[PDB]
């Protein structure tokens, strides 16, 4: 049914989030003369607990919670394939151990600044394109998740709620800039904690749900939610787990926080603290997914068939909140999900707009530009990116598959480039271009089942799906990343050797990286 009392509550919650963001904008209104990087990096005064809470709320979005609950819920995957929590936690631990220290110790402004200073502005933009694509598609996917969830719970028209949520998020991130998004994430993360953790005892107390512990090791209604990994599917699970471990590092939304930490040590400690917060935040998602897996849906008001029959298994968190939990607990859970989506999409929108106005515009297009012009183009870029993200979320039905493809492409392309600039010395532009081309070519020829793209190269173990398109059981993603990294090293060293030995003319080179 349509309950106004609760729609009013969520509108009030949105207004309070916007008011907190506006207050954070007003109070902390950076450098006195250089306000171009008083929005991007925040003035380097973000502390430890605030930054940890902020970036913890950045990774915990509604798409992440719904994906974990889906992976736990469905019988084929189970908990063993719910590799999002431990994948994110190991990603953050690995980043804080190795990548966080050199990024913050010397004062970079964004993610892409080390790429430009080594590979030239053209390759800086060429690496910006996958990052922008990934951020925009991730924001669109989680906005579509919010739209579907709110259309399920309150039964609001879907094209209004996502527009209002995106408008409010864009408005406060436009007005403040890394202080309106980091002083509201300490509120949104607490709201996520409250809304997710209160609903779990209410869901468990429902008479339909019975013996959540017993369903882990035994099967009564469906396959056990604990799940298993087959002998033949070890390589695919390792491929996806490496995707989640190593593709979660090179995002703009992560390095914008580690650069904003007050000191170098409070960046690594922030990363570890958030790697603990991610598991703390993901425990309720796993519990609710197990509750949905164990629930006898005939007893509830949802009725039979169960959601996995009606192809609604991608959303099992909102159904449990709406049907198993009471009305006000359902609104608490919906507020938690909306806070998670606004936090992650706000981080993505500010992060994707913190690369456009910083280097491809200010450092590439208009090198000599006034700071006020850069601030204004930052604000209009935030607004345009928010409008594009919500329009792509609302108008396109193929957002999830494009999100997965863009995240996989970011992992294949940017991460070898990220590891080459810092850890490896003597990497040139030619090897970077060769790695880009090889990674893009292998990812395109691998194909995607969601986009109905036929794979040009058939890896061993390929099998056709129900829709009639070939799927690759071979771990071509991590193999593509390894091939890109190896060919980056090989082409860089070969070009350096050729230009040092004198086989090629010193004037023939176009990128001029080796000579100068
Ligand atoms: C079962 N499906 C629905 C289809 C098969 O693939 C999946 O297991 C799956 C789930 C999640 C992902 C995924 C990939 C990347 C990311 C992300 O890019 C998102 N963040 C940017 C939030 C963190 C870094 O990792 C999140 C989820 C990829 C595949 C999900």
UniProtKB/Swiss-Prot annotation:
<dbReference type="GO" id="GO:0007271">
    <property type="term" value="P:synaptic transmission, cholinergic"/>
</dbReference>
<keyword id="KW-0739">Sodium transport</keyword>
<dbReference type="GO" id="GO:0031594">
    <property type="term" value="C:neuromuscular junction"/>
</dbReference>
<feature type="transmembrane region" description="Helical">
    <location>
        <begin position="235"/>
        <end position="255"/>
    </location>
</feature>
<feature type="transmembrane region" description="Helical">
    <location>
        <begin position="162"/>
        <end position="182"/>
    </location>
</feature>
<comment type="function">
    <text>High-affinity Na(+)-coupled choline transmembrane symporter. Functions as an electrogenic, voltage-dependent transporter with variable charge/choline stoichiometry. Choline uptake and choline-induced current is also Cl(-)-dependent where Cl(-) is likely a regulatory ion rather than cotransported ion. Plays a critical role in acetylcholine (ACh) synthesis by taking up the substrate choline from the synaptic cleft into the presynaptic nerve terminals after neurotransmitter release.</text>
</comment>
<feature type="topological domain" description="Extracellular">
    <location>
        <begin position="1"/>
        <end position="5"/>
    </location>
</feature>
<keyword id="KW-0968">Cytoplasmic vesicle</keyword>
<dbReference type="GO" id="GO:0001701">
    <property type="term" value="P:in utero embryonic development"/>
</dbReference>
<dbReference type="GO" id="GO:0006836">
    <property type="term" value="P:neurotransmitter transport"/>
</dbReference>
<feature type="transmembrane region" description="Helical">
    <location>
        <begin position="46"/>
        <end position="66"/>
    </location>
</feature>
<feature type="transmembrane region" description="Helical">
    <location>
        <begin position="404"/>
        <end position="424"/>
    </location>
</feature>
<dbReference type="GO" id="GO:0007274">
    <property type="term" value="P:neuromuscular synaptic transmission"/>
</dbReference>
<feature type="topological domain" description="Extracellular">
    <location>
        <begin position="293"/>
        <end position="314"/>
    </location>
</feature>
<keyword id="KW-0622">Neuropathy</keyword>
<dbReference type="GO" id="GO:0043204">
    <property type="term" value="C:perikaryon"/>
</dbReference>
<feature type="topological domain" description="Extracellular">
    <location>
        <begin position="395"/>
        <end position="403"/>
    </location>
</feature>
<keyword id="KW-0769">Symport</keyword>
<feature type="glycosylation site" description="N-linked (GlcNAc...) asparagine">
    <location>
        <position position="298"/>
    </location>
</feature>
<keyword id="KW-0530">Neurotransmitter biosynthesis</keyword>
<keyword id="KW-0770">Synapse</keyword>
<keyword id="KW-0225">Disease variant</keyword>
<feature type="topological domain" description="Extracellular">
    <location>
        <begin position="210"/>
        <end position="234"/>
    </location>
</feature>
<feature type="transmembrane region" description="Helical">
    <location>
        <begin position="123"/>
        <end position="143"/>
    </location>
</feature>
<dbReference type="GO" id="GO:0005886">
    <property type="term" value="C:plasma membrane"/>
</dbReference>
<dbReference type="InterPro" id="IPR001734">
    <property type="entry name" value="Na/solute_symporter"/>
</dbReference>
<feature type="transmembrane region" description="Helical">
    <location>
        <begin position="6"/>
        <end position="26"/>
    </location>
</feature>
<protein>
    <recommendedName>
        <fullName>High affinity choline transporter 1</fullName>
    </recommendedName>
</protein>
<keyword id="KW-1004">Congenital myasthenic syndrome</keyword>
<keyword id="KW-0325">Glycoprotein</keyword>
<keyword id="KW-0523">Neurodegeneration</keyword>
<feature type="transmembrane region" description="Helical">
    <location>
        <begin position="189"/>
        <end position="209"/>
    </location>
</feature>
<feature type="topological domain" description="Extracellular">
    <location>
        <begin position="454"/>
        <end position="478"/>
    </location>
</feature>
<dbReference type="GO" id="GO:0055085">
    <property type="term" value="P:transmembrane transport"/>
</dbReference>
<dbReference type="GO" id="GO:0005307">
    <property type="term" value="F:choline:sodium symporter activity"/>
</dbReference>
<dbReference type="InterPro" id="IPR038377">
    <property type="entry name" value="Na/Glc_symporter_sf"/>
</dbReference>
<feature type="topological domain" description="Extracellular">
    <location>
        <begin position="67"/>
        <end position="78"/>
    </location>
</feature>
<feature type="topological domain" description="Extracellular">
    <location>
        <begin position="144"/>
        <end position="161"/>
    </location>
</feature>
<dbReference type="GO" id="GO:0033265">
    <property type="term" value="F:choline binding"/>
</dbReference>
<keyword id="KW-0966">Cell projection</keyword>
<dbReference type="GO" id="GO:0016020">
    <property type="term" value="C:membrane"/>
</dbReference>
<comment type="similarity">
    <text>Belongs to the sodium:solute symporter (SSF) (TC 2.A.21) family.</text>
</comment>
